[PDB]
């Protein structure tokens, strides 16, 4: 089996993609955030405590015919950006682009955060992380992915994410009309429960590439590329007017800048992140100081290829017994 869907950006940023999933008997469309840097599958619900739902779409599991409480089990994860959400878990069958998974284990929210009342765009998450970080107790459980992996045509999924406009995200097959050249595949460590893997240098604009090995998991849910602070600090040098900004929480630059390129490896193969890719725009409405899209990662204890690395490439998730990542320009 295969399945394909367009992935959409919720605004005009690109602070994040959804997806439409549907679940239950007849079907519930909700739009998730597929998260590679997660594996829990949650979503709004009936269940979620009301004055924190704001425009979101629920999942009410007593109108799906094949829902059935997954008995005892509760879950709550926190988020690295510190959102969270917590509830209880229901069994029911669930669909992404055509391809369909029975028993899917989805987390229904009871609380989330403030973050996640205030964007009403997005109904949940599924995450397609390594089911080892799943939070489901007493019982983990298993991501979408790991449950359609053995009925897949091959047992990957590839993300295409689009720069301000839709993209895909196809399970079960490679569409090699979708990216140009060649894939360049690298190895992935799932010791933390990442798609970690590591970089092989940079280069900024138009200099010379920087032979570095750089360590960080490739993170669909996260919007920014997070960095060592010794190659974030090299890219906004080459900016006039860029400077870290405690108060603001980042590298913040004059929005009259024009970006250069942020060039990534991957093995020998490159992949070239267009200067305007980098642009979050105004800090708040009216400035003319504009958020960066490459931060530095001190602190966070782990580098983050986030949307803005990603929508520059192809990239595939090869589930395979030893797992790869696989990146191609396009």
Request: with cysteine; aromatic share 12%; hydrophobic share 35%.
């Amino acid at each position: 089996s295969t399945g394909s869907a367009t992935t959409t950006p919720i605004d005009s940023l690109d602070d994040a993609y959804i997806t439409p999933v549907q679940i239950g008997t007849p079907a519930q469309t909700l739009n998730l955030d597929f998260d590679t840097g997660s594996s829990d599958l949650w979503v709004f619900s009936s269940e979620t405590t009301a004055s924190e739902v704001d425009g979101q779409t629920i999942y009410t599991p007593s109108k799906s015919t094949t829902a059935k409480l997954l008995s005892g089990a509760t879950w709550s994860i926190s988020y690295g950006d510190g959102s969270s959400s917590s509830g209880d878990v229901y069994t029911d069958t669930v669909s992404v682009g055509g391809l369909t998974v029975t028993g899917q284990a989805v987390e229904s929210a009871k609380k989330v955060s403030s973050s996640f009342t205030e964007d009403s765009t997005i109904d949940g998450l599924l995450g397609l992380a390594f089911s080892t970080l799943n939070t489901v107790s007493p019982t983990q459980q298993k991501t979408f992915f790991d449950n359609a992996k053995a009925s897949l045509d091959s047992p990957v999924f590839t993300a295409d994410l689009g720069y301000h406009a839709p993209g895909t995200y196809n399970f079960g097959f490679i569409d090699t009309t979708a990216y140009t050249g060649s894939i360049t595949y690298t190895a992935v460590s799932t010791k933390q429960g990442f798609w970690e893997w590591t970089s092989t240098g940079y280069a900024v604009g138009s200099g010379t590439f920087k032979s570095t090995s750089i360590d960080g998991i490739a993170d669909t849910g996260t919007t920014l590329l997070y960095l060592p602070a010794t190659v974030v600090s090299a890219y906004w040098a080459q900016v006039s007017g860029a400077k870290s900004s405690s108060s603001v929480g980042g590298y913040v630059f004059p929005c009259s800048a024009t970006l250069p390129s942020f060039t990534f490896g991957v093995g020998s193969a490159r992949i070239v992140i267009p200067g305007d890719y980098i642009d979050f725009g105004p800090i708040s409405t009216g400035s003319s100081s504009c958020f960066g899209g490459i931060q530095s990662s001190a602190g966070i204890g782990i580098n983050i290829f986030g949307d803005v690395a990603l929508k520059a490439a192809f990239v595939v998730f090869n589930g395979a017994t030893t797992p790869t990542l696989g990146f191609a320009s396009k």
